[PDB]
Amino acid sequence: SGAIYVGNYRVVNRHLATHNDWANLVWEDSSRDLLVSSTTAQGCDTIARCDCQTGVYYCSSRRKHYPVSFSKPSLIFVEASEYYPARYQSHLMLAVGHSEPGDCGGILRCQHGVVGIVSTGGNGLVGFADVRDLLWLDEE
């Protein structure tokens, strides 16, 4: 589990979104595994605006933050997904690291702020749903 809290937005994995998230929907995309809902209180996070490929992510199944190198956002076939459709997610970034399903929502961050959230795992790889292209998160 985990979210990004930027302004009056809550960014979560679409497959973990709550009824309250869907009842307060701003934007959602199944292909990216992302959903954004409205908040009453302002959030503590800053979104990175950059093409960094190095950062640090939080892994709840280790209670640890790990430094990683990660690929640029792209289209990848996810094998045997079991919290959503199991085939071809977009705006995905991969790194070598540990990820189990409950790790979804952990933040990846660079020197510029939050890059994205854990969305996939398997075979010593971790995938992160990118948010750096969602410029509208910074305003309104």
Ligand SMILES: Cc1nccn1-c1cccnc1
């Ligand atoms: C973890 C992950 N997310 C998307 C693809 N993968 C991956 C790639 C290759 C081998 N195992 C997992």
Ligand SMILES: [Zn+2]
């Ligand atoms: Zn950066």
